Amino acid sequence: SYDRAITVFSPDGHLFQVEYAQEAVKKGSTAVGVRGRDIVVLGVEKKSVAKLQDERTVRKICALDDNVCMAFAGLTADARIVINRARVECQSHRLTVEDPVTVEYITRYIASLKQRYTQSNGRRPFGISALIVGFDFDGTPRLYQTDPSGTYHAWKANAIGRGAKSVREFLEKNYTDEAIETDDLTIKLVIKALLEVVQSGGKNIELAVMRRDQSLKILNPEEIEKYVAEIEKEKEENE
Amino acid sequence: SIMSYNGGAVMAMKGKNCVAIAADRRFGIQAQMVTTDFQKIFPMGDRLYIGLAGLATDVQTVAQRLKFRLNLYELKEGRQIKPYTLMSMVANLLYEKRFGPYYTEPVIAGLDPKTFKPFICSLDLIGCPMVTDDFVVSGTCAEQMYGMCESLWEPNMDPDHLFETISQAMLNAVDRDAVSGMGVIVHIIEKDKITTRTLKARMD
Amino acid sequence: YDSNSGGEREIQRTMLELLNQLDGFDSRGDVKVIMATNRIETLDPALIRPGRIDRKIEFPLPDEKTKKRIFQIHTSRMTLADDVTLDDLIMAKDDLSGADIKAICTEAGLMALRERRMKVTNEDFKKSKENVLYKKQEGTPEGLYL
Amino acid sequence: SRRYDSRTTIFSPEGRLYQVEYAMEAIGHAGTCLGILANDGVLLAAERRNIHKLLDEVFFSEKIYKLNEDMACSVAGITSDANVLTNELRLIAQRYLLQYQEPIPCEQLVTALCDIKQAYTQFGGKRPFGVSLLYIGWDKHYGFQLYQSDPSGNYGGWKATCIGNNSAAAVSMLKQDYKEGEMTLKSALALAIKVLNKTMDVSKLSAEKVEIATLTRENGKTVIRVLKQKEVEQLIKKHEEEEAKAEREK
Amino acid sequence: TGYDLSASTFSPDGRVFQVEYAMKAVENSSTAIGIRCKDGVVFGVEKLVLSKLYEEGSNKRLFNVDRHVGMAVAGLLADARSLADIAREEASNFRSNFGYNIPLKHLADRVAMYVHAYTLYSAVRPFGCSFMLGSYSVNDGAQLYMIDPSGVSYGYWGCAIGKARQAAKTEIEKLQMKEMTCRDIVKEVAKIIYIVHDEVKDKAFELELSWVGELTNGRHEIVPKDIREEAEKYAKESLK
Amino acid sequence: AERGYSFSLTTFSPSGKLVQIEYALAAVAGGAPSVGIKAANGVVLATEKKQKSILYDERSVHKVEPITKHIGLVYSGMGPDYRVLVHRARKLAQQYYLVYQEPIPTAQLVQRVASVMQEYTQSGGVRPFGVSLLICGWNEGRPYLFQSDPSGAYFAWKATAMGKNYVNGKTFLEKRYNEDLELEDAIHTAILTLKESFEGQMTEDNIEVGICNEAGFRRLTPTEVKDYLAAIA
Amino acid sequence: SSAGFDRHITIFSPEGRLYQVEYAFKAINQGGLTSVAVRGKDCAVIVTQKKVPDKLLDSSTVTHLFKITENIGCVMTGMTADSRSQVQRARYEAANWKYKYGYEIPVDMLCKRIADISQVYTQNAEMRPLGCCMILIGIDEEQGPQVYKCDPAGYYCGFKATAAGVKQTESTSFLEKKVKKKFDWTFEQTVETAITCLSTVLSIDFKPSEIEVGVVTVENPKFRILTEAEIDAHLVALAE
Amino acid sequence: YDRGVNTFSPEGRLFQVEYAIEAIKLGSTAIGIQTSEGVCLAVEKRITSPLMEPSSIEKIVEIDAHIGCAMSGLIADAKTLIDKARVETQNHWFTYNETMTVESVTQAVSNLALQFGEEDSRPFGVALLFGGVDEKGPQLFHMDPSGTFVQCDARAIGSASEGAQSSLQEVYHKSMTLKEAIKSSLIILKQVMEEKLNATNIELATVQPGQNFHMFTKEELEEVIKDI
Amino acid sequence: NQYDNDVTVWSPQGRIHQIEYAMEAVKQGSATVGLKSKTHAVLVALKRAQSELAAHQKKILHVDNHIGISIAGLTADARLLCNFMRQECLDSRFVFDRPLPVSRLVSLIGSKTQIPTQRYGRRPYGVGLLIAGYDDMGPHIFQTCPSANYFDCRAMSIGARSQSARTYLERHMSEFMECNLNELVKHGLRALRETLPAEQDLTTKNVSIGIVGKDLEFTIYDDDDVSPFLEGLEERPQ
């Protein structure tokens, strides 16, 4: 028959609905991201676009504010829940005490809300994760992550999904400390990971860059189309 | 008074095969005017209107809250809205607060969806339905409304004499009395077409 | 259950005997044991300890690199009308395992065998491909398996 | 009471939602609908599993249910199971008109109903909705829009759909028909006729078993044209002459 | 196969296993009996002795719920004190809204609706207490009611619960009961109380006795050992 | 999980079919035959009530329980949970009657009841209604006959039948009854399809024929039942 | 058929049948009682009995006759524990109709409001179905007497003469042939046939003090029952 | 044979509480030390990949100004208890005009030690090391997920709680100075870490009455490292 | 084995094992002996520790002025009832301005633990409380169990292998009624010294002692407070 427990957890040393939800994380859509002194870049792929449908309905990136960007990996069902949830959270935050708390209030909101979401009975843990994108005040970058256990953590590189997207974060470690001094090569890293990650279709790839305090806009197939051509040229300069 | 705060007068007069309803365009606090382009009577359904006299809040509140329950009845049953169904729909809305009721003088005059036969009714602010076989008048001064129309309205009135009778009735009342004024809109609807004319009134 | 066996626990006790055989007392040489199945919930925490405690394998679903290397290598011995290009094959159907890519090619030269060797009908080929295309396109969503 | 709970809400060990995977098996069966891009209008068609001719068909729109005078939704699933969501979203669309006085856009209309279906999946152990229905309408911003609902609580909205079982031969044909929009509203409906005639189980394109409702953008009434089945037969025979004309090539 | 799990479910033999387990649950407890004479009602309780165990006159199953009513209980003792407070609170509601003595018939009926209700739900559990209710009044008289964990409300002139000896109620018909004045009755019951329940099972034991009736003017209290002293006086010389 | 307040017991089969709701259809199939016909002026209902013993008098218990003066109705299969929704429909039909001031049509009874009946099936811990309701009456000058099911799905049939061998009586009502006929001719074929599965004895208490007139529903006494059917049909 | 834990709760079955509810069939067998209802022209007569295993049995307390209203009484079967909880509910809605409505009570449809509460008992998530069987008489204006026997499935049932229970199946077999044919019914005719219908079952025919014959006839509409006096006279009148 | 997990099993005791103890195996360990001069505590962040940022995860948090604390096992589990305990000590300084010192914090957490239940929810498996300075001077207290507060002067948690304390109980003789225990802890630290000690690996918790607060500082964390 | 799953099931012998499994938690507690004389009462407990440096866990703790108590078993449910124990104390001290006799006081605790032992999913409370308090009639020694049955006695012993203390008690506990506080405390620890393994102490700080009287307010005695009690005694034989 079927013998299993739920919560919590098991004497074997690992939880049930938590680390198993990590399988629903790693199976999520492949997405990457980086941080920078001015322009922060992100990416998403593995959306399985058939070219026959509308791209705006499958968009994986929303924005609570122009300062802070939302990037998540997982099913799009619970997405709008959190979208409705978190936007009202950052709204009521905008309401009283106009100057917002910096980066430690919002990253602990979804994290702690998801922790107590595994706490009370009649609450099924989410099998999705998220990584906050944006820029801290005074020109600093900000990025964090959400964990099924509710632990907030800051990464130097965003690598999730398949093993092909983990190479995109591997290439960032090859730029060492100085690189990049131009925003051209930093965008080209996404155009280079476009071939490596997923099916290399040049379609599901989407990115947005936020320079300093300027609100980012979705890349139109002109800039990113020009930076896609230099991505193959820059790889040829190393030969 | 409460009804004399914003003022206003709603005069609905039934004709032979048609029905006419009129309301002044003046919107102001006490004796101080604000704007003359404010709309009081709102369209409800098809070939049916409603007059409202009282606090401009309950004018906008009820008409919007009525529009809420308006469609919900029509979306469940594709048949029309009937003047009887919409009549008690306001009465149930005005009865939601027994000791807190909204202050308005709703006047519902609309054609039967089945036949050209017109229908007129007027409800109290507490939701009391009332119907007349001639006309329904609601406004600040009841002396000029009941005095004139009883010596004016006739059992059989064509749209030609129906509009011209209430026309001079509003001309003689505004140019003499004080409260109302600043333009009067008149909605005269029949089975074939909907006619809307705006009467001339003093600007002072 | 089959005939008079069990059911329920007696199918389990013959699998527990499958352990005691394989456990096992007392065998030294090989007899190299290799077990396989579609999904294993079967082996008890006790059964995996003697074996296989070292190496058990999992192969993920193939990607565009594996599927192209699956079909081109499968067809290295025998192709259909030669001319086969694998760029549009993996691009058209997205996605499914390299199992059925031989099946659609099985019926490719099979339907052309009505002409007894070689021919391709553009209206018929895409119509015959519609049968397998819809076969995978009936169960397309899961999900969003993710 | 832990053994009596079948863990509906809780997931499956395989990573899939155990209750939702068995839910969408009913969506692949039962309801059948379609959608396509069309200029200055939008069309909807469905085939009934009640198509047995002993019915009165006095319901007028049945599988076509019209939520508002300006909006209709083609339903696939259990009738009364969907009827709970109909009046709900109808009130959500009506409460929007109350605090606004402006038609409810299609974007937030779908995300509002999908969360209602999601709430029962995430907690309560309640039976999730096995109803997947389409969406049509128009807004002053993005214009014509098409959407789909999923039992897991996700919006399946795209510019095309395959629901729920048949239409197979037309499905791959729709990808060859992917040329975006046209009208001549009768031409786009002609393309829908070859879908119903060729891919039907008994074929013959039975007129009483199917109903076509079209929304025509009009300022500001947005007239929805509901065909009376008197002009469907001439619309059926319209493309049957074109389908007989299409086979004149080969 | 699990039909005894939910107390809200029946059984393949068409009865309640939760009650069948509750009936014998009271039998394992020490014996507590009761009897009623014409002008009074008599209660009794046996107190077992294993090692010491503790101070005499402790945790006696004899309780006093009301002026004219009393409790002779058996089974699990903590479940009895809970029913003692419920019967006390019910007696408080009657003396408040009305202000006179609660009739024994409906007082047992209120508890009958309670004990029955807990057996219906699987959430709560049935009661392992089978007690005795009896009372006397000038306008009512002596009645005695036997309540069982199944929730059946009824009464006889006498009943016996607790241990299975049951021979202590046999000699009562050999003696004058309804004819006697309830005074000598106290010492007339205790004769075989000592004889039967042999010392092989339990080496030592102790006996409690309580009475309510006309001699106390409707009041209920445990009869003291020093007064009238003839309780255990005649009990020691009647063993033969 | 959560309370124990009776969360939904209804799950989905591997094919997606309902579990305990389809089992309620077996009670409808294992119930008693009930038939109804929508033709022309009004709707006619023919039910079946037979006493299991000679000590039962049908003059007390009535199968037909009209919801409104103009609205009749019958049922099939299983009583205990039937009277719950009946009286519930009596309280529910008042909101439409008080607020909208109108003899509520049968179509609105279908929309409101089947929605609550579907919500009742969605709620667990309770057995779904095993009662298939035939809703009829007269509204807007054109009557209606609507059939519900334990799952809540509502249909519309000219001549419908339920109970044992309902598929066989449905074909007879498809052939013998067609287009529309007068209420007198509707009572005829309504008893003939009821005499199909009926025993060899038909009296005033064996069958009861309700009829919905354009003037509103009128329940016929067993007198008129023995007068028209004696000599059944 | 059964699958999973359905045996351990109260719900339907994979075949749509019931187990718990059908185990309430023999829930009356543990009581081992019988009640038969016979109604005449102007009269209605109920016949019941009781078992006296011990001489300590009190006739008043173990009396199975329950009186709901002065005009309308009742009787029960099966285990008496579940019956008493339904007694007050039959008294409750009674006083509700006496208060609010102010007349002779729903002599016809009262079984619907009682079975509704009886169905709530069955419809509850986890609770005891309360397999006690309710039986009522009735009095109406120029309708003659009424007889109603309700079962704890949640439905209303009543007719001229009805007997349901353990041995009541053979009792109705005689009543079918005894009533018709064609016959009338007088006062003593219904009392005499109360034994003869049971005479087809068991009828040990012993001292009447144990058997209780309920009777209601319209002279003074108030329901009532004599004590031991002429019931024995009606027992010797039927046997000549 | 899993009944309710709260139901007092055949052995018997709670299931989930017995399970939550094993939840310490999936997370790092710490080492507590107490001395008359001050209380010093050490931990290891268990960095899996260089992508981990050191200041992101901290295993030592200060509940009250003079009262430090250390978590165990998961992070967000203690975070609900950590942050809410800071509200406790602050309201105590509102009513009594004095902050909770080392004691009233314990009973505050001891009352809520097990709040869990199914009906009327899930207990956390995080062990807590309560440091601070009360009127009696520097003190360090310990509690377990089972809920029973027992006073432990110098306590270690984690999967190393077995081994690290074994040698630690021997060296706690009162004749040892605070400075001797500081370098005695890093001896056990370098043995329990697989990765070479670096600025991002470990942190220190030191609280004293005179030097404060402190808490802990930056760049003084790296001085004890190179001394390994 | 399918009928043993739930709590509501009574055993084939008619016993609920859940209370018996809660009795195991009381036995695993430290050995403690409460006792009273006809004049003054003395209760003695034992302190335990998981590690050497860990301070010995206290058991005997003061609640009411004239009522001392020990504790054993679950500490969680004990501290819960502990806050409830302070409540009823100050209740009668406020409204009635008088303390609560231990007789009717514990009757509330037995009823407080009755609900969790009944409803499904609720758990009993393992409790080792040994209550010693003074009403107008003198001292009383009760006991506490998850079955919620308190027994009035002169003395009782609970905890690990504490039955050995009763064997020393049954003869001595009858003769301990006439002894004054001084020798009673040292005779008290003489009962618990065979409850510990005879090959080791039995130190000063691992044992809990308290004394309460009619005119004497209960004071906790531990660590150096036990030194006058342990001095001037004879060691156990071999």
Single out the residue of A120, A111, A131 nearest to residue A25, CA to CA.
Answer: A131
Gap between the Cα atoms of D144 and D36, Å rounded? 11
Burial (CB count within 10 angstroms: exposed 0-12, middle 13-18, buried 19+), residue G83: buried
Contact residues on chain B for F100, CB-CB shorter than 8 A: 73, 85, 88-89
In this structure, what token pair is assigned to residue B43?
A: 């369209």
Single out the residue of D7, D26, D3, D45 nearest to residue D206, CA to CA.
Answer: D45
Whose tokens are 């699998």? That residue is C15
SS3 H143: strand
The torsion of the CA quartet F143, F144, F145, F150, rounded to 10 degrees, works out to -140
Inter-CA distances, A215 with A4, G170, H180, Å: 49, 90, 55
SS3 D231: helix
Query: What residues does each domain of chain F span?
Result: 1-233
Gap between the Cα atoms of H105 and H124, Å rounded? 18
Q: Where are the alpha helices (DSSP H) in chain H?
A: 15-22, 76-95, 104-111, 161-168, 178-192, 223-226
List of long-range contacts for F167-174, beta carbons under 8 Å, 24+ apart = F168/F196, F169/F33, F169/F35, F169/F193, F169/F196, F169/F197, F170/D54, F172/F196, F173/F35, F173/F37, F174/D54
Angle at D65 between CA D61 and CA D66, to 5 degrees: 100
For residue E134, give every residue at least 6 positions away whose Cβ sits within 8 Å of its Cβ, in sequence order, or none: E34, E36, E41, E42, E43, E69, E70, E72, E104, E142, E143, E144, E145, E155, E212
Contact residues on chain I for D2, CB-CB shorter than 8 A: none
Gap between the Cα atoms of F175 and F171, Å rounded? 6
Strand duo B32-35 + E143-147: pairing: unpaired
According to DSSP, residue I151 is labeled: -
Gap between the Cα atoms of B104 and B94, Å rounded? 9
DSSP string, D10-38: S--TTSS-HHHHHHHHHHHSS-EEEE---
Task: List E49's β-bridge partners, or say none.
Answer: E204
Gap between the Cα atoms of F223 and F44, Å rounded? 17
Domain count, chain B: 1
Say if residues A54 and A42 touch (Cβ distance below 8 Å): no
Please give, one letter per residue, the 3-state secondary structure of I79-92: HHHHHHHHHHHHHH
- Chain C partners (3+ C-beta pairs within 8 A): A, D
Contact residues on chain I for H12, CB-CB shorter than 8 A: 21-22, 24
Q: What are phi and psi of F46, to 5 degrees?
A: -130, 115
Whose tokens are 């059984």? That residue is E11
- What's the one-letter identity of residue I106? V
Task: List F134's β-bridge partners, or say none.
Answer: F74, F147
Say if residues E114 and E120 touch (Cβ distance below 8 Å): no
The torsion of the CA quartet C26, C28, C31, C32, rounded to 10 degrees, works out to 120
Alpha-carbon torsion D172, D177, D179, D182, what sign? negative
Search chain E and give the residue with CA nearest I36. E55
Gap between the Cα atoms of H17 and H5, Å rounded? 8
Say if residues B181 and B202 touch (Cβ distance below 8 Å): yes
In this structure, what token pair is assigned to residue F191?
A: 């008893």
Gap between the Cα atoms of E6 and E19, Å rounded? 12
Q: What are phi and psi of H118, to 5 degrees?
A: -85, -70
Task: List A141's β-bridge partners, or say none.
Answer: A135
Say if residues D78 and F115 touch (Cβ distance below 8 Å): no
DSSP string, chain E: --TTS-TTS--TTSS-HHHHHHHHHHHTSPPEEEEE-SSEEEEEEEEEESS--S-TT-S-SEE--SSSEEEE--S-HHHHHHHHHHHHHHHHHHHHHT-SPPPHHHHHHHHHHHHHHHHH-SSS-------EEEE--TTT--EEEEE-TT--EE-BSEEEESSS--GGGTGGGGS-SSSS-STTHHHHHHHHHHHSS-TTT-SEEEEEEEEEEGGGTT-EEEPPTTTT-HHHHHHHHT--
SS3 D105: coil
With touching defined as 3+ CB pairs under 8 A, do chains H and I touch? yes
Gap between the Cα atoms of D190 and C107, Å rounded? 33
Gap between the Cα atoms of G227 and G219, Å rounded? 19
Gap between the Cα atoms of G133 and G25, Å rounded? 11
DSSP string, B73-124: HHHHS-----HHHHHHHHHHHHTSSSSS---B--EEEEE-SSSS-EEEEEE-
Strand order in the sheet with A158-159: A158-159, A31-33, A39-44, A209-211
Of G12, G112, G172, nearest to F55 by CB-CB distance is G172
Report the first-to-last Cα separation within chain I, whole angstroms. 48
Is the N-terminal amide bond of F176 cis, ω within 30° of 0?
no
**CA Rg, chain H, in Å?**
18
Of A27, A50, A199, nearest to C146 by CB-CB distance is A27
Single out the residue of I176, E32, D152 nearest to residue C144, CA to CA.
Answer: D152
In this structure, what token pair is assigned to residue C24?
A: 């096992």
According to DSSP, residue C76 is labeled: T
Task: Out of 3.40.190.290, 3.40.605.10, 3.60.20.10, 3.40.50.2020, select the CATH number for domain E1-240.
Answer: 3.60.20.10
Please give, one letter per residue, the 3-state secondary structure of chain F: CCCCCCCCCCCECCCCCECHHHHHHHHHHCCCCEEEEEECCEEEEEEECCCCCCCCCCCCCCCCCCCECCECEECCECCCCHHHHHHHHHHHHHHHHHHHCCCCCHHHHHHHHHHHHHHHHHCCCCCCCCECCEEEEEECCEEEEEECCCCCCCEEECEEEECCCHHHHHHHHHHCCCCCCCHHHHHHHHHHHHHHHCCCCCCCCCEEEEEEECCEEEECCHHHHHHHCCCCC
Angle at B148 between CA B144 and CA B150, to 5 degrees: 125
Task: List I141's β-bridge partners, or say none.
Answer: I132, I153
Q: Does B67 touch chain D (CB under 8 A)?
A: yes
- Beta-strand ranges (E) seen in D72-209 are 75-76, 132-135, 138-139, 143-144, 147-148, 161-163
- What's the one-letter identity of residue H208? Q
Of F30, F80, F125, nearest to G154 by CB-CB distance is F80
Alpha-carbon torsion H222, H223, H224, H225, what sign? positive
Please give, one letter per residue, the 3-state secondary structure of chain A: CCCCCCCCCCCCCCCCCCHHHHHHHHCCCCEEECCCCCEEEEEECCCCCCCCCCCCCCCCEEECCCCEEEEEECCCHHHHHHHHHHHHHHHHHHHCCCCCCCCCCCHHHHHHHHHHHCCCCCCCCCCCEEEEEEECCCCCEEECECCCCCCCECECCEECCCCCCHHHHHHHHHHCCCCCCCHHHHHHHHHHHHHHCCCCCCCCCECEEEECCCCCCECCCCHHHHHHHHHHHHHHHCC
Task: List A44's β-bridge partners, or say none.
Answer: A31, A206
Superfamily, domain F1-233: Aminohydrolase, N-terminal nucleophile (Ntn) domain (3.60.20.10)
Burial (CB count within 10 angstroms: exposed 0-12, middle 13-18, buried 19+), residue H11: exposed
Gap between the Cα atoms of C17 and G183, Å rounded? 78
Gap between the Cα atoms of E94 and E102, Å rounded? 6
Q: Does A214 touch chain H (CB under 8 A)?
A: no
Inter-CA distances, A148 with A16, A145, A152, D22, H127, Å: 11, 10, 10, 26, 20
Angle, helix B83-94 to helix B56-76, in steps of 10 degrees:
130
For residue C109, give every residue at least 6 positions away whose Cβ sits within 8 Å of its Cβ, in sequence order, or none: C80, C81
Please give, one letter per residue, the 3-state secondary structure of G47-100: EECCCCCCCCECCCCCCCEECCCCCCCEEECCCHHHHHHHHHHHHHHHHHHHHH
Say if residues B80 and B112 touch (Cβ distance below 8 Å): no
Gap between the Cα atoms of B60 and E57, Å rounded? 81
Gap between the Cα atoms of I121 and C66, Å rounded? 54
Gap between the Cα atoms of F101 and B127, Å rounded? 14
Technique used to solve these coordinates? cryo-EM
Say if residues F38 and F90 touch (Cβ distance below 8 Å): no
**Inter-chain CB proximity B73 and F100 less than 8 Å:** yes
Task: List E35's β-bridge partners, or say none.
Answer: E42, E158
Gap between the Cα atoms of D26 and D78, Å rounded? 9
Burial (CB count within 10 angstroms: exposed 0-12, middle 13-18, buried 19+), residue B74: middle
Q: How many CB atoms lie within 10 A of CB B42?
A: 16
SS3 G130: coil
The torsion of the CA quartet G206, G210, G216, G222, rounded to 10 degrees, works out to 150
- Beta-strand ranges (E) seen in chain I are 32-36, 41-46, 61-62, 68-69, 131-135, 138-141, 155-158, 207-212, 219-221
Strand order in the sheet with D161-163: D161-163, D32-35, D42-47, D210-215, D224-226
Gap between the Cα atoms of F169 and F148, Å rounded? 17
Mutation pick from D1, D2, D4, D5 vs chain G, by most beta carbons of G within 10 Å, is D4
**Inter-chain CB proximity F126 and G154 less than 8 Å:** no
DSSP string, H159-175: TTHHHHHHHHTTTT-TT
Gap between the Cα atoms of G91 and G99, Å rounded? 12
**Inter-chain CB proximity I149 and E54 less than 8 Å:** no
Q: What are phi and psi of I92, to 5 degrees?
A: -65, -25
According to DSSP, residue I30 is labeled: P
Strand duo F159-162 + F34-39: pairing: antiparallel
In this structure, what token pair is assigned to residue D20?
A: 């939702």
Gap between the Cα atoms of I222 and I232, Å rounded? 18
User: B-F interface: how many C-beta pairs under 8 angstroms?
Assistant: 20
Q: How many CB atoms lie within 10 A of CB G123?
A: 18
**Inter-chain CB proximity H16 and A153 less than 8 Å:** no
What is the domain-level CATH number for residue B197?
3.60.20.10
- H221 HSE (CA, 13 A, CB side): 21
Task: List E33's β-bridge partners, or say none.
Answer: E44, E160
Mutation pick from C66, C144, C145 vs chain A, by most beta carbons of A within 10 Å, is C144
Of I3, I14, I151, nearest to E28 by CB-CB distance is I14
- What's the one-letter identity of residue H74? L
Gap between the Cα atoms of F153 and I109, Å rounded? 56
Gap between the Cα atoms of G146 and G72, Å rounded? 10
Q: Does D3 touch chain G (CB under 8 A)?
A: yes
